[PDB]
Amino acid sequence: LHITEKLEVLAKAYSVQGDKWRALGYAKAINALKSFHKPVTSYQEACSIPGIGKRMAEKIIEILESGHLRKLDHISESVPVLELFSNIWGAGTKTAQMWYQQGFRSLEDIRSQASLTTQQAIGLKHYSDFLERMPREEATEIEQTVQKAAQAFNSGLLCVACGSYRRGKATCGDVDVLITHPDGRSHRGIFSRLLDSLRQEGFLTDDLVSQEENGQQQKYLGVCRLPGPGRRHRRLDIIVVPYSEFACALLYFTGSAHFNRSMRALAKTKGMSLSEHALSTAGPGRVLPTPTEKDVFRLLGLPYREPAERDW
Template structure:
């Protein structure tokens, strides 16, 4: 097989040598760029996927490194690491050593992108005799992360790149950026020099280049280019519609739909959630304040007590971590007697609907079953509790109380700042364009019902942050041979479920120091 590949390399018109059973003659559009993707730190499955993507775009991508390769693409490697690898291949040629960002930009452009400094792999700048300035544990669940952040310029740039990766369905890249952000957030002072980052975990080559760019120029050119790109702006607008995910937004963009006005004029069929999301777009993209969350909590609390006097309700999500604003409001409901939570959700939803508080709602049933053999699949952040996804009608009129279903006077008006109008928002209703003209606003509200036996796990899972929970599950699996979810903790070595009645117990079972909600803002 090796001689056959080499003969194909010597004759570019023969097709894409890295293709297995594919690549027709003449399918290579860019013979001047012969690519090899380094598997080290990238992983075999991701490398296979990206190699196939490159070939579909007309690039020549080699499965094995050989003398025809002109561009070596890697992920989270320094130039020193790649050069050492090249040395092990007995190759001393001058080839381009490129970060994966060059590859992804080339895929989007449909042709080889210009090679800029930010695409080139960088040498490690720190010397071996330098002492690390900060000591940061590898897992975010080992660290205390408050809302204070001394490196917002760095974390904002990396968070934007993470968001773009997530919207582009590049989950691995998004997680890598999020982990880097979490490390920077926990540092006790601002980063002013690359030398300060020596020894810190989760800071790959791409991340370090972004940080260096911000430190030297005040901004990240990559983050600015991403923020101003038409595709990112369109994805932000379209996924800002309640009920629209990245996959649907991508499909609309391929049809030439970039904003709300184009969507409304396109004749696309929308489901009920998307219709409600479009109708209340400005409200739902306006931050929700803590006072508004508390007002909604009073209403939901009244509903819960009315249908089940012994039931309990807890505000969860970012507000439980102390955040002053959020994009939605989440509540966890349970009953101290196991089994009494069954049937509670339909009654609460019915009460809220009868009082006119729900503009839209969709309820899912509890589908969790505990198996004696343990979880059938690795735990994830998606649980199977009974949930209600809703658009809540919050009374904000002066002199009214959100807790009064009849609309009688009293209480305080909400004071959340208005969001900037999105492209196409001019086609929304007059009330939506001028929120002050109506005495209420629409808010995203999620209700979750948990049995009391699973309440501690549900409370931990739904408090967040998302990365903190991901790191807890990673720690459980990699360090303790356990499986953690919002339902349970399973010990794989002892082949049994580990029970807990509090978050403190769960941390103890995992061998971790307890971290309160206010310090889980990874």
């Protein structure tokens, strides 16, 4: 806390206005300022911290000394509105800035005047719902609904809830279901059947991303709702992967996002490349053998981590 509470509003201001690299820098400086054993008190001290350069140091000496940070006085008043628009699924910083330039200030303005993509229209229709977390118990019910429908046309299908669910969180922003088949081939063409089964029973309410004319579809992003009173619309993400990519896909879909980024960053320093598909060597490199998550960790020179230890 302290200096960090002021750096954070700045970091978010930069993020929502699209300065993602500078926001990134603020993020990492804030982390470093979160785990330093002591209240920094000197320019020299701050600078000695990995993640904190001269500039960020300049701004720390200004905080606990004058109590203020003049930079916060220069945050565009547009920022709260950019964040409002930005929270619409399918609208990012470019779209929000454009709406704002065109004079849009409220979701009512958006509803009545903006031209919305199909995704943004669904995003708007479920604005509040997409901003809530569900109890992990609800994520379980949702994943089982998907699994039960999948196992209907092929009981061999492996279905696994990933993301914050697999990391053990008490609540989940949505449900991430990884689907594969141990025989290494029966995963092909399952999306059509699965999705239609799920539509058939009124489980799926909206589709956000779903290239079903592509026999090579990898992902489904959309919306579902369990039956009964007091149910909310929930975001559901499904990926279907070849068994050969199981460990990398599992690792990717388990996150956290910051964890994946860090791990891929490490692979690169070691002459590798890590994706949801595989871990390979840096033109056509070599695909490395990764039958299990542990294999990816080992090859990177790391101690294995339980999903819950990946909650970065």
